[PDB]
Tab-separated table of C-alpha atoms in Angstrom:
chain	number	residue	atom	x	y	z
A	1	UNK	CA	149.156	36.710	114.064
A	2	UNK	CA	148.671	40.353	113.112
A	3	UNK	CA	145.796	42.740	112.399
A	4	UNK	CA	145.727	45.784	110.140
A	5	UNK	CA	142.506	47.794	110.151
A	6	UNK	CA	144.467	51.016	109.657
A	7	UNK	CA	142.856	53.489	107.278
A	8	UNK	CA	141.875	57.138	106.910
A	9	UNK	CA	138.216	57.606	107.837
A	10	UNK	CA	138.368	61.329	107.072
A	11	UNK	CA	139.233	62.036	103.437
A	12	UNK	CA	142.026	64.533	104.104
A	13	UNK	CA	144.737	65.840	101.779
A	14	UNK	CA	148.493	65.899	102.371
A	15	UNK	CA	151.069	67.918	100.433
A	16	UNK	CA	153.966	66.076	98.793
A	17	UNK	CA	157.243	67.846	99.676
A	18	UNK	CA	159.047	65.799	97.026
A	19	UNK	CA	156.652	66.995	94.324
A	20	UNK	CA	158.880	69.574	92.582
A	21	UNK	CA	157.170	72.877	93.378
A	22	UNK	CA	156.626	74.955	90.240
A	23	UNK	CA	156.434	78.360	91.921
A	24	UNK	CA	155.390	79.860	95.258
A	25	UNK	CA	154.618	83.490	96.038
A	26	UNK	CA	152.291	85.923	97.791
A	27	UNK	CA	149.107	85.960	95.709
A	28	UNK	CA	145.962	88.020	96.277
A	29	UNK	CA	142.638	86.184	96.520
A	30	UNK	CA	139.121	87.630	96.585
A	31	UNK	CA	135.971	86.213	98.176
A	32	UNK	CA	132.346	86.414	97.038
A	33	UNK	CA	130.579	86.907	100.370
A	34	UNK	CA	129.262	90.434	100.811
A	35	UNK	CA	132.313	92.533	99.973
A	36	UNK	CA	134.724	91.579	97.189
A	37	UNK	CA	138.051	92.409	98.835
A	38	UNK	CA	141.558	91.006	98.386
A	39	UNK	CA	143.328	89.022	101.106
A	40	UNK	CA	147.108	88.620	101.281
A	41	UNK	CA	148.194	85.016	101.833
A	42	UNK	CA	151.001	82.585	101.012
A	43	UNK	CA	150.155	80.401	98.015
A	44	UNK	CA	152.091	77.525	96.449
A	45	UNK	CA	151.834	75.642	93.154
A	46	UNK	CA	152.776	71.990	93.648
A	47	UNK	CA	151.291	68.599	92.771
A	48	UNK	CA	149.039	70.190	90.150
A	49	UNK	CA	147.153	71.613	93.131
A	50	UNK	CA	146.934	74.739	95.288
A	51	UNK	CA	148.228	75.005	98.855
A	52	UNK	CA	148.534	77.948	101.245
A	53	UNK	CA	149.469	78.590	104.874
A	54	UNK	CA	149.223	81.277	107.554
A	55	UNK	CA	152.596	82.663	106.471
A	56	UNK	CA	155.817	81.809	104.637
A	57	UNK	CA	156.720	79.575	107.579
A	58	UNK	CA	154.236	77.157	106.013
A	59	UNK	CA	153.377	75.931	109.510
A	60	UNK	CA	150.433	73.648	108.803
A	61	UNK	CA	148.058	74.045	105.870
A	62	UNK	CA	144.866	76.015	106.505
A	63	UNK	CA	143.174	74.597	103.421
A	64	UNK	CA	143.941	73.025	100.051
A	65	UNK	CA	142.378	73.903	96.697
A	66	UNK	CA	142.014	71.511	93.762
A	67	UNK	CA	142.908	73.365	90.564
A	68	UNK	CA	141.886	70.436	88.321
A	69	UNK	CA	138.335	71.198	89.450
A	70	UNK	CA	138.661	74.951	88.923
A	71	UNK	CA	138.299	76.618	85.525
A	72	UNK	CA	140.860	79.306	84.705
A	73	UNK	CA	139.421	81.912	82.340
A	74	UNK	CA	140.006	85.605	81.638
A	75	UNK	CA	137.498	87.904	83.338
A	76	UNK	CA	134.511	89.096	81.308
A	77	UNK	CA	132.354	92.214	80.999
A	78	UNK	CA	130.242	90.968	83.906
A	79	UNK	CA	133.382	90.659	86.031
A	80	UNK	CA	134.599	94.151	85.138
A	81	UNK	CA	136.739	94.442	88.269
A	82	UNK	CA	138.690	97.690	88.600
A	83	UNK	CA	141.796	95.614	89.310
A	84	UNK	CA	142.802	94.668	85.766
A	85	UNK	CA	145.334	91.979	84.860
A	86	UNK	CA	143.407	89.399	86.883
A	87	UNK	CA	141.625	86.093	86.278
A	88	UNK	CA	138.877	83.987	87.852
A	89	UNK	CA	138.382	80.307	88.673
A	90	UNK	CA	135.005	78.582	88.384
A	91	UNK	CA	134.099	75.540	90.481
A	92	UNK	CA	131.145	73.110	90.330
A	93	UNK	CA	131.135	72.067	93.987
A	94	UNK	CA	132.298	75.546	94.990
A	95	UNK	CA	132.030	79.239	94.113
A	96	UNK	CA	134.024	81.320	91.631
A	97	UNK	CA	137.417	82.490	92.887
A	98	UNK	CA	139.459	85.477	91.717
A	99	UNK	CA	143.219	86.003	91.492
A	100	UNK	CA	145.094	89.155	90.483
A	101	UNK	CA	148.718	90.304	90.353
A	102	UNK	CA	150.703	93.547	90.265
A	103	UNK	CA	151.857	93.259	86.651
A	104	UNK	CA	151.220	91.145	83.570
A	105	UNK	CA	154.126	88.793	84.229
A	106	UNK	CA	153.296	87.931	87.841
A	107	UNK	CA	150.001	86.816	86.302
A	108	UNK	CA	151.509	84.753	83.486
A	109	UNK	CA	153.647	82.879	86.015
A	110	UNK	CA	150.512	81.883	87.923
A	111	UNK	CA	148.368	81.133	84.873
A	112	UNK	CA	150.867	79.127	82.824
A	113	UNK	CA	151.125	76.922	85.912
A	114	UNK	CA	147.608	76.953	87.359
A	115	UNK	CA	146.207	76.058	83.937
A	116	UNK	CA	148.622	73.123	83.778
A	117	UNK	CA	146.713	71.812	86.796
A	118	UNK	CA	143.214	72.967	85.852
A	119	UNK	CA	143.298	71.607	82.301
A	120	UNK	CA	143.441	68.223	84.032
A	121	UNK	CA	140.442	66.037	83.200
A	122	UNK	CA	139.711	64.589	86.639
A	123	UNK	CA	136.441	65.030	88.530
A	124	UNK	CA	134.290	62.685	90.594
A	125	UNK	CA	132.308	62.431	93.850
A	126	UNK	CA	132.836	60.046	96.765
A	127	UNK	CA	130.948	58.391	99.623
A	128	UNK	CA	131.406	60.838	102.484
C-alpha cells in the first residue's frame, strides 16, 4: 500500500509565474518605525498580490504583501507628506504603508492595478 501525510505545516505563500504579471517596477516604500524614509526595492504586481525581491534578479522572495487586505486611499491632511503624488495602504493585521512615485502616471499605473487587488472582498483568520 501507500501513505500520503504530505502537507504544509507552515502557511507559506508561493508566487505563480504563470499568473500574467500586470506590471513590475522599482517602487518606493516608506516605513512607520521612528523615521519615515523611503526604501528602494523591486516590486511586482501579480496574482492580485504584492511581491518583491532583493533586486531585479528576483532571487527568492523576501516577503509577500496581500493587497486585498490593504486599503488604497489618497493621503489626507494628517498625512501631509512633502512627497506629493503618493498614496497609503491601511491594514487591519498590520500598519499603514505608503507608496509614492516620480510623476502622476507612475502612480496611476500602480494604483489602477493595486486597487484591482485591494478592492477584493477577501479577509479571514486561520489556526496558526
